[PDB]
């Protein structure tokens, strides 16, 4: 099945349907290097999971941490020569950039050459994300209805 290549990253244990979000959002397709994706993989250990293998590619630390918001319980696995040489799990990053959208219609991020940037704060029952620009704090549930 899909589980190891010579070198690269195996992103394992993504819940169903997030695998394509991650591909899109993190532009992981835009590399002409061997990616194998398997969606709706069985895995009784999940019920249904998704796995992406990017061959000869290593996700620098923070890249891993951005996945915290979407497939939070996924294991990034380093294979830097024929097997699992480093395991990693997503931690919430302190800032999430480029990928989110400001809920505030009257935020200026919307009409301009400006990457979104949000401050992360896991507080109480969720995570609050404060916009760089309009300084307004929203629940990630609002921000991710998107």
């Amino acid at each position: 099945g899909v589980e190891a290549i010579k070198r690269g990253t195996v992103i394992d244990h993504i819940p169903a349907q997030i695998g394509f979000k991650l591909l899109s959002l993190f532009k992981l397709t835009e590399t002409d290097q061997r990616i194998t994706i398997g969606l709706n993989l069985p895995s009784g250990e999940m019920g249904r999971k998704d796995l992406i293998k990017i061959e000869n590619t290593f996700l620098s630390e923070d890249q891993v941490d951005q996945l915290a918001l979407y497939a939070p319980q996924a294991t990034v696995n380093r294979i830097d020569n024929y097997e699992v040489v480093g395991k990693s799990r997503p931690s919430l990053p302190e800032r999430i950039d480029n990928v989110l959208v400001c809920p505030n219609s009257n935020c200026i991020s919307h009409a301009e050459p400006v990457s979104s940037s949000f401050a992360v704060r896991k507080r109480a029952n969720d995570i609050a994300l404060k916009c760089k620009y309009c300084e307004k704090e929203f629940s990630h549930n609002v921000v991710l209805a998107n």
Binding site: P103, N104, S105, N106, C107, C134, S139, N141, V142, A145
Partner: protein
């Protein structure tokens, strides 16, 4: 003489349940077998001092569908003179001299009741007056509820959206609390809840009501989902966009809905009902806009005709 013959239709509070029922009966009759020359030779004035293209075209189609002539205007601008000097009183005192009935939308609460005092014997009908009344809308709404539910008594009606400022939700509650056994669910953003007096009338008659936070709490109990448009501009854009995971209706949420539940909306519906909702059977707001004809035709037939033979 019919009960409503040559009566001024100005407020819903003013109409008794008996009169609501006569209006709804006639309308169910005209729909079915319409007499198209009943108001032949009448000249009705469509005086929209505030413009509303849908209403003005529903009312005017009605006048026509019964064989009536129409003279009238539209502002949200200055028509002529009436900007200065022309007091609504002087303007009606001259228009009573011309026509048989006056349909009128005006941007100030109480403009139809003032008009009455100058219309002489000409009946005036309220097509909306500021934030006060819109009887014609509540009538077509009752007709659609009656026509889908088979009754107006013992229903579970969820009212959602701008409950504080929606002209209509205020009136629909007054009309439906003139019938027995109804239960109301009020789902509204905190800052836009049902004003205290609606709720106090509701507790004197002792009608069953409860506030809620999202449609999905009562999805499966609701017979009628009446939705109003949460107006974006009376709110901060970061506050409008932040309410929960919204109170906007998507077909998905209808998944646990009764087979007979209908979703109603005065319209415009910009975003508070999504396109897939349109395809589901529970979609009933365009059908509703069409029942405006028979309701308003009913109204014009009784006010202007002594006895209705149909």
């Amino acid at each position: 003489a019919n009960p409503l013959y040559q009566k001024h239709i100005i407020s819903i509070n003013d109409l008794s349940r008996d009169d609501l029922n006569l209006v709804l009966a006639t309308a169910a009759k005209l729909k079915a077998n319409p007499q198209p020359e009943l108001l032949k030779h009448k000249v009705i004035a469509s005086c929209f001092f505030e413009a509303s293209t849908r209403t003005r075209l529903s009312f005017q189609t009605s006048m026509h569908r019964l064989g009536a002539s129409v003279v009238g205007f539209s502002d949200s601008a200055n028509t002529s003179l009436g900007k200065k000097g022309e007091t609504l009183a002087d303007t009606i005192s001259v228009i009573s001299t011309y026509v048989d009935a006056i349909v009128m939308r005006h941007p100030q609460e109480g403009a139809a009741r003032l008009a009455t005092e100058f219309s002489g014997n000409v009946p005036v009908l309220n097509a909306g007056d500021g934030s006060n009344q819109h009887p014609t809308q509540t009538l077509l709404d009752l007709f659609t509820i009656q026509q889908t539910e088979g009754r107006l008594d013992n229903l579970h009606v969820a009212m959602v959206g701008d409950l504080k400022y929606g002209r209509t939700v205020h009136s629909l509650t007054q009309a439906l609390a003139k019938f027995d056994g109804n239960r109301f669910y009020f789902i509204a953003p905190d800052a836009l809840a049902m004003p205290e007096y609606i709720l106090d009338m509701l507790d004197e008659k002792g009608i069953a009501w409860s506030l809620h936070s999202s449609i999905e709490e009562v999805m499966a109990e609701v017979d009628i989902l009446y939705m109003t448009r949460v107006q974006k501009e009376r709110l901060d854009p970061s506050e409008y966009a932040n309410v929960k995971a919204q109170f906007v209706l998507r077909a998905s949420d209808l998944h646990n809905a009764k087979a007979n539940m209908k979703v109603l909306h005065p319209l415009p519906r910009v975003d508070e009902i999504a396109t897939d909702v349109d395809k589901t059977p529970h979609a009933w707001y365009f059908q509703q806009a069409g029942n405006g004809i028979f309701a308003r035709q009913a109204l014009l037939a009784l006010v202007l005709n002594r006895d209705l033979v149909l």
